[PDB]
Each structure stands twice: as structure tokens, then as C-alpha cells.
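Sequence only, no structure available. Ideas?
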Amino acid sequence: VGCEECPMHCKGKNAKPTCDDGVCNCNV
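Reply:
I predicted one. C-alpha cells follow.
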């Protein structure tokens, strides 16, 4: 995953993606 490829991976409704040291992660 990546910062420019996060939205594609994690996609829901109340799940916002985040970038931490090149580590993408979606929470809220």
C-alpha cells in the first residue's frame, strides 16, 4: 500500500486512510 494508493485499497464510508512512516492504515 501507499499514500497515493491508499484510497483504492481501503474503501468504505467512515474509514479514513493515514500514512505513518510509509505505512498506510485506514481507521476513521
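The helical segments are 6-9.
Hope that gets you unstuck.
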